[PDB]
RNA sequence: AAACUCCUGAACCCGGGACGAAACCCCCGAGGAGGGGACUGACGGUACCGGGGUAAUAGCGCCGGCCAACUCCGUGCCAGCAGCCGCGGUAAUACGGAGGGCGCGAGCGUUACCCGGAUUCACUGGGCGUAAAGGGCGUGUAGGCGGCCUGGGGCGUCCCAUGUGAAA
RNA sequence: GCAAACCGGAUUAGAUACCCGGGUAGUCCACGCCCUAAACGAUGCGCGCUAGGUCUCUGGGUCUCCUGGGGGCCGAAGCUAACG
RNA sequence: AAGGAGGUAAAAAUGGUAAAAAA
């Protein structure tokens, strides 16, 4: 269940931080800035030689950590990547982000991934019409994902609206500050929206 | 500017009335990310000697590869004694899917997507050599012309 | 005696490539004339001819030798990489529409004799048939 | 599609009944190479128009009798012997294998 | 094997001779038991290690160990014949369980609860 | 991380609330084709929709190499571990315990059982000088398998067209 | 003549053995029966193909040598994990 | 002879020392 707890303890575990807890985990510390490097007793002993496979494994962890999910469903949908054709890992990253929770995230609706899951699961976020629960709900090229009727009347909703402006959308996430909506479009990739994890490594490790 | 991946060291030794004097070898693969590669097996008393030296035997003994579209042209079977490296180029979405020796040598090369197996003796030394000749023996349409044009 | 002269041709040919020797002698037969015809025409050997040695019409096959490579000794790259007897006198390996080889994941060359003739790989493909898959070469 | 077989008539041994030595080719659904094997069916010859060796064509018939299926129709070639001959030799050599 | 020999002969299948005649897919078999003994692993060790001669519901004895360190079993327990040797006790296979119809682990096992008994180190205080 | 600060709202009440069913039947036209008329809910006041609203179960295995995860006590070939190599003979990163970390997450491990790895019955894919392995040599039955020209046959073989290979 | 077993002698801690002295089966010939082996090149046979140098058994050719069959050696390319 | 080598020669009165274990 999304680990739950010392979250940006992984902000340091992977090595380099991530937009995780939101405002703070991006403020003068994702718990980083102050002292970024893996926790634990051995916190800073003298970094050993990560076996090649383990660099790979740590990448897998890395990616699924930023994406905010257990690696079970993650496994299944990586298989779905193998099946649904395309240069596997690319259209994988795509059909990973196409998931509704972080669609809601980068659409600038939720400040952080966890917060996103809450909002979406409570049907605060509607999708092209009906208030879809399920944080795991892939959309399609054209669908307009909005919020709830009681959301224009909600608070940190307007926080998100006002404090976000001056920030451009993931070139397919066509929002609305005018009505609190958001169209879905084309499939993004490694470069449409980038992140600090080498995909090839991830896939090679995974399917072994 | 290449990249200096190692891939095992050897803690050799010989005996004598005088104890047992060890030694070290340094299997080392140096490849330029995308273009060429080179293998070097160090061989000195104390380890790092043999490691740096190995980097240099590798850097002297190079060889490049028809690294086109991220892969290799045709596919080959190479054998070294009882060690056989099995190589087939791969359409994208594959990876350097291979052992340790191979992914070492070929990521140092620049091989992005590669279907590869390895039959017979899996002895890392001979295996590494075998990979090096997999590179050494790669032909293309152009190469084909050289021979198959006619002189 | 010989249980299969065709193979013996392909093999003597090997020997020629491995010794570098202008041309080699071979038993003259019609089928192998078709074969070495394909060999010549499909970018490979240097030629075939209806020659003769002591009362026996034979064939002189000149082998193509590439540019003098260097390093330590030339060993000018060999036009004939390697050949194999696909459909051996044990395995009557029959090939057709979906049964066609590839060789060298792209190029390569295999030749299969059928009712519609001694077609090259892509040739057998281009006419859309099949038959015994005789020999492969790179 | 009444299946018909072309085979070497073996042994006139019975009246109105002949044995027929059929033999079929086959591949090898594992090893490629071709093979061959003999099968003895029941030729129905109500007037001994067939005899030693003469290849005839036999027919998938009404159940003529007890395993006695497979009538005849078109006789083919006579003066065969040689074939039936070799088969016979093999038979005697079957009686050349004893653990008693 | 030159193809034709292959056509006639062919080549022989695998066959497995079983490493556990607890048998009939028995990963828990009846362990009623008898005796206790001591043994001593090929060479460089020492201890006792039980007997579990079991009888299962099938038959025979065997040498089933225990999860080591402090027993409980006197002569019954219905130790569920488990499985897996070790370079000692010329057998060891078909292990005792620590749960079963006796044994029930070691009180104070703040770790291998999954096996060595213990419900849960419930501190309470 | 905590306590706290705010936000939400697992659970759970009040309300409303199903689709799952139009025929046979009745009449108009003949009981024919066509039109209207009428009975039919187990599931369950559940799914579901509206309002309201409480911070509310986290565990199992690993942490000597294989293999991502180390320091500290006790124990001192005793107690033990163990899939293989081995780990304990009074400084154990292996045993128990404890801090911390790896992994997994309403799951975690164990044994069992099959296929893989295993190209370790090798048809793609193997071997027999000395590693397992050439018959003590002959002989020759059957079988296997065959040089070079010509044409006929078209049996294997390739192709062409359909029947079929139900559904799943 | 020899030579297991067998005996005596020497030997040694002991000597049922190696060494000495004697000695029977056997080792020999006819017929039969056994049918094993390091029965070893530790390499099944038959065929075609791939540098030569060199010693020699042999058959042909007036012959410093060409040529077909052999038993040795060295080494092309190759092949083996290595010796080879 | 300078060598490697293929066949035929010479050459030892005696004995038991265990072993858990270190780099």
- Distance between CA atoms of residues B116 and C123, nearest Å: 30
| Greatest CA separation for chain B | 64
Q: Domain check: are B55 and B94 in the same one? A: no
**Is D34 in the C-facing interface, judged by CB distances under 8 Å?**
yes
**A13: which residues sit within 8 A by CB, 6+ positions away?**
A38, A39
List, as residue ranges, the binding site of A for Zn(2+): 8, 11, 25, 30
What is the CATH classification number for the domain harbouring E118?
Answer: 2.40.50.140
Angle at A119 between CA A176 and CA A191, to 5 degrees: 60
- Considering the domain architecture, whether residues B33 and B92 belong to the same structural domain is answered as no
Supply angle C-alpha B103, B104, B110, rounded to 5: 75
- d(C-alpha A184, C-alpha A166), whole Å: 20
How far is the first Cα of chain C from the last one, in angstroms, to the nearest whole number?
Answer: 29
The residue to which tokens 């998100």 are assigned? A160
3-state secondary structure of A196: coil
B147: phi then psi, degrees, rounded to nearest 5: -80, -65
Our count of domains for chain B comes to: 2
State the burial class of residue A123 (Cβ atoms within 10 Å of its Cβ: 0-12, 13-18, 19+). Answer: middle
* Amino acid D28 CA to nucleotide G48 C1' distance, rounded Å: 30
Q: Does C8 contact strand G, using a CB cutoff of 7 Å?
A: yes
E8 to chain C, any CB pair closer than 8 A? The answer is: no
> B44: domain CATH number?
3.30.160.20
> Measured between CB atoms, does C67 come within 8 Å of chain E?
no
Tally Cβ neighbours within 10 Å of residue A203. 25
Residues B50 and B81 in one domain: no
Q: Does one domain contain both B14 and B36?
A: yes
- Say if residue C58 is exposed, middle or buried (CB neighbours under 10 Å; 0-12, 13-18, 19+): middle
Domains and CATH numbers, chain C: 3-80 (3.30.1370.30), 81-138 (3.30.1490.10)
- Asked if residue C22 lies in contact with residue C45, where contact means CB atoms within 8 angstroms, the answer is no
Instruction: Please report, rounded to whole angstroms, the spatial distance between the CA atom of protein residue B82 and the C1' atom of nucleotide G81.
Output: 8
Size of interface A-B (CB pairs under 8 A): 16
Answer yes or no: is E74 CB < 7 A from strand F. no
Residue E3 at interface with chain C, using a CB cutoff of 8 Å: yes
Q: Does one domain contain both B47 and B101?
A: no
Chains D and B touch (3+ CB pairs under 8 A): no
Q: Within this chain, do residues B71 and B138 fall inside the same structural domain, yes or no?
A: yes
Nearest partner of A205 among A59, A12, A35, judged by Cα:
A59
d(CA D35, CA B42): 58
D-contacting residues in C 89-118 (Cβ below 8 Å): 90-93
CA pair distance A59, A57, nearest whole angstrom: 5
Experimental method: X-ray
CA atoms within 13 A on the CB side of A61: 13
- Contacts with A63 (C-beta within 8 Å, 6 or more apart), sequence order: A195, A197, A199, A202
Contact present, C130 and C95 (Cβ < 8 Å):
yes
**Contact predicate A103/A97, CB 8 Å:** yes
Torsion angles phi and psi, residue D35, rounded to 5: -140, 180
Query: Three-state SS across B57-89?
Result: HHHHCEEECCCECCECCCCEEEEECCEEEEEEE
Q: What are the sequence ranges of the domains in chain A? A: 1-96+194-208, 97-193
- The nearest CA of chain B is from the CA of A52 a distance in Å of 8
Whether residue B39 is found in the same domain as residue B71: no
Q: Which helix (H) or strand (E) is D24 found in, with range?
A: strand D17-26
> From the Cβ of C21, is strand G under 7 Å away?
yes
Query: Which residue of A80, A200, A201, A208 is the best one to mutate when testing the B interface, meaning the one whose CB has the most B CBs within 10 A?
Result: A200
- Beta bridge partners, B28, equal B40
Which residue segment(s) compose the domain that B34 sits in? Answer: 3-63
Q: What is the DSSP annotation of A3-65? A: --SS-TTSTTTSSS--S-SSSTBTTTBSSTTTS-S--STTTTS------HHHHHHHHHHHHHH
DSSP H stretches of helix in A122-194: 155-164
Quick check: D54 and D77 in contact, CB under 8 A?
yes
Other CB atoms within a 10 A radius of the CB of residue D62 amount to 9
Class for the domain spanning A97-193: alpha beta
Structurally, chain E folds into a number of domains equal to 1
Q: List chains touching C (3+ CB pairs under 8 A).
A: B, D, E
Architecture of the domain defined by A1-96+194-208: Orthogonal Bundle (1.10)
Cα-to-chain-centroid distance, residue C118:
12
Answer for the pair A194, A52: CB distance below 8 angstroms, yes or no: no
Domain that holds residue E123: 1-125
CB C90 within 8 A of CB C97: no
C-alpha–C-alpha distance, residues A129 and A144, integer Å: 8
Contact C67 B141 (CB under 8 A): no
Residue C98 beta carbon within 7 A of nucleic strand F: yes
Instruction: Please state, in angstroms and rounded to a whole number, the distance separating the CA atoms of residues D64 and D24.
Output: 23
Nucleotide nearest B20, from its CA to each C1':
H23
Contact C72/E at CB under 8 A:
no
Are both B21 and B8 inside the same structural domain? yes
Nearest-by-CA chain C residue for E3: C90
Structure tokens at A129: 């019409």
């Amino acid at each position: 269940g999304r680990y739950i707890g010392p979250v940006c303890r992984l902000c340091r575990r992977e090595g380099v931080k991530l937009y995780l807890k939101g405002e703070r985990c991006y403020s003068p510390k994702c718990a980083m800035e102050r002292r970024p490097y893996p926790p634990g007793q051995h916190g800073q002993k003298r970094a050993r030689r990560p076996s090649d496979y383990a660099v790979r494994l740590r990448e897998k962890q890395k990616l699924r950590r930023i994406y905010g999910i257990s690696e079970r469903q993650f496994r299944n949908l990586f298989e779905e990547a193998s099946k649904k054709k395309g240069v596997t890992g690319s259209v994988f990253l795509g059909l990973l982000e196409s998931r509704l929770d972080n669609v809601v995230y980068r659409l600038g609706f939720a400040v952080s991934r966890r917060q996103a899951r809450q909002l979406v699961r409570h049907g605060h976020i509607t999708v092209n019409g009906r208030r879809v629960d399920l944080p795991s709900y892939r959309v399609r090229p054209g669908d307009e994902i909005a919020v709830a009727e009681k959301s224009r009347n909600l608070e940190l909703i307007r926080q998100n609206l006002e404090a976000m402006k001056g920030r451009k959308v993931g070139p397919w996430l066509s929002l609305d500050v005018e009505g609190m909506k958001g169209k879905f479009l084309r499939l993004p990739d490694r470069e449409d929206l980038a992140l600090p994890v080498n995909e090839q490594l991830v896939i090679e490790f995974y399917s072994r | 500017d290449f990249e200096e991946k190692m891939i095992l060291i050897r803690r050799t030794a010989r005996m004598q009335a005088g104890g047992r004097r060890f030694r070290f070898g340094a299997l080392v693969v140096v490849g330029d990310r995308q273009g060429r590669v080179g293998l070097g097996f160090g061989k000195a008393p104390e380890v790092p000697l043999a490691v740096q030296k190995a980097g240099y035997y590798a850097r002297r003994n190079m060889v490049e590869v028809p690294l086109q579209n991220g892969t290799i042209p045709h596919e080959i079977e190479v054998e070294f004694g009882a060690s056989k490296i099995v190589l087939k180029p791969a359409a994208p979405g594959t990876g350097v899917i291979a052992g340790a020796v191979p992914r070492a040598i070929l990521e140092l090369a620049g091989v992005t997507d590669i279907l590869t197996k390895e039959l017979g003796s899996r002895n890392p030394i001979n295996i590494a050599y075998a990979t090096m000749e997999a590179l050494r023996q790669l032909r293309t349409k152009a190469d084909v012309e050289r021979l198959r044009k006619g002189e | 005696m010989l249980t299969d002269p065709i193979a013996d041709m392909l093999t003597r040919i090997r020997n020629a490539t491995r010794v570098y020797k202008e041309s080699t002698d071979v038993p003259a037969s019609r089928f192998k004339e078709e074969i070495l015809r394909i060999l010549a025409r499909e970018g490979f050997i240097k030629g075939y001819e209806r020659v003769d040695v002591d009362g026996k019409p034979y064939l002189r096959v000149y082998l193509k030798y590439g540019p003098r490579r260097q390093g330590p000794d030339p060993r000018p790259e060999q036009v004939i990489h390697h050949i194999r007897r696909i459909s051996k006198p044990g395995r009557r390996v029959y090939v057709g529409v979906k049964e066609i080889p590839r060789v060298r994941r792209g190029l390569g060359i295999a030749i299969l004799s059928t009712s519609k003739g001694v077609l090259t790989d892509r040739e057998a493909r281009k006419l859309g048939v099949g038959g015994e898959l005789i020999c492969e070469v790179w | 599609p009444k299946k018909v077989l072309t085979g070497v008539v073996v042994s006139d041994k019975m009246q109105k009944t002949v044995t027929v030595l059929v033999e079929r080719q086959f591949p090898h659904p594992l090893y490629g190479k071709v093979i061959k094997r003999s099968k003895k069916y029941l030729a129905h010859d109500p007037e001994e128009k067939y005899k030693l060796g003469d290849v005839v064509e036999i027919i998938e018939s009404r159940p003529i009798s007890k395993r006695k299926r497979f009538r005849v129709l078109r006789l083919v070639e006579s003066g065969r012997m040689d074939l039936v001959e070799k088969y016979l030799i093999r038979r005697q050599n079957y009686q050349s294998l004893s653990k008693r | 094997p030159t193809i034709n020999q292959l056509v006639r002969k062919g080549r022989e299948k695998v066959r497995k001779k079983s490493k556990v005649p607890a048998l009939k897919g028995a990963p828990f078999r009846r362990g009623v038991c008898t005796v206790v003994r001591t043994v001593t692993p090929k060479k460089p060790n020492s201890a006792l290690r039980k007997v579990a001669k079991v009888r299962l519901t099938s038959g025979y004895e065997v040498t089933a160990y225990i999860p080591g360190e402090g027993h409980n079993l006197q002569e019954h327990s219905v130790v569920l014949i488990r499985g897996g040797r070790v370079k000692d006790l010329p057998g060891v296979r078909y292990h005792i369980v620590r749960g079963v119809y006796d044994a029930a682990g070691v009180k104070d096992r703040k770790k291998s609860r999954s096996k060595y008994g213990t419900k849960k180190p419930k501190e309470a205080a």
